[model samples]
Target: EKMVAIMKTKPGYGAELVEVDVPKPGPGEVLIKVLATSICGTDLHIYEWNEWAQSRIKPPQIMGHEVAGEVVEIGPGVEGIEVGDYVSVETHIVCGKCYACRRGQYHVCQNTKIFGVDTDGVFAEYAVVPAQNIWKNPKSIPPEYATLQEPLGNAVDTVLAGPISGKSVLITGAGPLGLLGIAVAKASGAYPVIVSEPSDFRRELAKKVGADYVINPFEEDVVKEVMDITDGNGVDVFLEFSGAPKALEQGLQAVTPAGRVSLLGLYPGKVTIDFNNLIIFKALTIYGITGRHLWETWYTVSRLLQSGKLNLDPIITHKYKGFDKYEEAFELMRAGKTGKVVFMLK
Candidate 1:
């Protein structure tokens, strides 16, 4: 069967739209008729030849991962998922035999296959994904909103990774996922959630979505502001969602001793830091978060939505109609104008 798909012929090149043959699910895989797919910041990095995908992703690949769709056909050995079931892509396909997989850390599996980068991704009419990569969406949620679940899961992993109930928390960065992190932090019981971003436009939106204090890192000393808010002790938790090296440096400085620090964003290059001068001196607990915490993160996401604790609908700021204009969608995302670039498809 023929279906429309997008492919990038080379690195540092824009993806071109093309009509190609729809692939069938292999054994243990499922063919998903994509309902909608959302643009993420990672998609932009790949387009501009940012460090990670440039080295990892070869030529001629599709460029999307956060997708929501319905099962049209299920292959052999697949369990629990059925035809017409709504689902979202987990993207990280772990080798179950890896040491990380054996210990239940599937996201960090040593030899992992990412859907968009390492494998054929979901930028088409139909996406073929392994059954294990599908996370069944709750029937109560709308399909459009479900496309945000993958990155939302990242926010869930970072903002709610550790104890945040009534504790002071600091989130540095106001990108798409960082914006979601703000809502997730507030809904997960992080009081007085402070955000630092240089963009005035994002700062306004951050204030609207439960940010207690929005600090402009360019305008003021971020670490100093965080300390002032917490009465010179700093926040109980510091979440680094921006891949910028400076955000990491400032985040470590703002965290209280023995506090938890979560790294959800990507940092492709190395930056020098006094490890013992800040973190070790304070006995901080630092975590490098990649994705959701297995089924446990999924459970919390479900509960938060079901119990009326977290609302994800508000952070969806931008929408695009056709998938062919994917280039424009990605351009706006890179410009930092859109919160989430969602493409509507049948």
Candidate 2:
């Protein structure tokens, strides 16, 4: 049987929608019939054939990780997962015995392999993933929202890493992840959520997602606006998701002394920071976040979705009918016009 997939067929070029043989699950793996999959920053990098994509991704590979689907087949060694289950995939395939996995930090496992990049991905009608990476979705949540759990988990980890209740937060970057972070912070009791972004579309999306104040770093001074909002005390917490050097520096300066800063964005190259002023003198606690922490972050994401406390509808702005719109979806993303663009699989 054949299935449709979007793949990177060559280096230094865009991906193509092609028909390929549907993958069958190998040992300890499960085959999923994709229900919906969303475009991500990683996919954009791969689509643009950017420097990071050139260095990290090999050619002729299906390229996507955020997926929600129904299990149609289970491999020989797989247990606990069944053929009829609904699941969302965790992209990181970790070795259980690795030093980091053994220490319960599987998110940073020493022998981690990312799905779609290291192996085949889910931008298809059928995708095979390890049983350990399958996160069973509750009956209440639909596939579109379920597909967002992986990225939403990142937001949850960043917001809850420290106390968010009643603390003022400044989230730099109004991209998809940044918008998710804003919603998470607002629902988790963070006060005065401020967002900074140069894109007018994303800035408006930020406001719709519960940002108390939206600052265009190009028009208004980010640090000054944040200071003014917080009565010159600055924010108690700063979450950097833009990965822009300027945003990083501004976030560091806008946060209050002795505050907490969480960095989840991936920067393009080396960035110079004033350690004395931003770190030591300010006494700020900085956290570098990569992926969600094993099943811990998943648990939180599930609860938040099931509890109906988090509103993700605004963040998922656009949805297409099928895989045929793959290029159009990426074009919208590249043009910086959409929030979360999802492709509903057939």
Candidate 3:
């Protein structure tokens, strides 16, 4: 069977939507008929053929990971998940015997193959994914909203990594992930949720999504504003989602002494920090977060959505009718005017 897919056909170039043969599920894999797929920052990197994509992505490969779909078929050894069930994918495909996986820290598996990067992805009419990486979505959830669970899980993992309830949390960077982080922090009971972003539109969106205070780093002194908001005590928890060196430094400086810091963004290249003054002297507990914790974070995200505590509709800013609008969708995201952009399939 032939199907339409968006693929990276060359190095240092954008992806092409083309006709490709449908993939069959291997053992312990299931074939999915994609209903909706959302664009991610990683996808933007691949689209722009950035340095990271140049080094890691191979050409002529399907290029998306976040998806909501239905099981069309199951391969040998696949159990529990059945055909006709709704599902969302967990992008990290880990080696069960890897050191991290063996230690039950599968999120940081030593040998992890990410879908859309390491392997063929779900930006197509049909995709085959490892059964272990599928999370069956509830029947009530719409496909467009379900597609966001993967990234939402990232926000959930970051917010719950430490004790967030009743803590003064400062989240730097109001990008899609940062916006989601703000909502998650608010829903999780973090107090005085503060956000700092350079984007004017995103700052407004951040406020719309429950940010107690949104600071434009370009317009105001982020550290001083955060200090003022916290009554000179500084934020109790700092969640760095911007990946900007300046924002990272500012967050480090704004956090309270002996506070917790969760770093989730990917830096451009090398970043130098003041170890003595910013870290050691302050006695901060820093955590470098990568992906969602296997199954645990997913469960929390699901429950939050199910209970109506987490409403993601406000975060989804754009929607396209089909895959043909791939470039337009990507361009919208690149322009930084939109939040979560989804392509809906009928």
* Model 2 stretches astray by more than 4 angstroms: none
Q: Candidate 3 lDDT, tens digit per residue, 314-333?
A: 78998888798888888888
Q: State the lDDT of candidate 1 residue by residue for 1-346, as single tens digits.
A: 8888777777675777888888889899999998888877777778777677678888787778888899999998888989999888888878889889999988888988778888888888999899988888787867667888788888889887788889999998888788888888888778879999888888877887779999999889999999899999989999987788898999899998999999987776787887997888999998888877777887776666666555556567766676867877777777778777788786
Worst 10 residues of 1 by lDDT: 305-314
- lDDT, candidate 1, at 300: 73
Q: What is the lDDT of residue 59 in candidate 2?
A: 84
Clashes of 2: 0
Candidate 2 local lDDT, 11-33, one digit each (tens)? 87678889999887889888999
Compare candidates 1 and 3 on TM-score and give the better one: 3
Off by over 4 Å in 3: none
Off by over 4 Å in 1: none
RMSD of each: 1.8, 1.1, 1.2
lDDT scores of the candidates, listed in order: 0.83, 0.90, 0.90
In angstroms, what RMSD does candidate 2 have relative to the true structure?
Answer: 1.1
**Clash pairs for candidate 1:** none
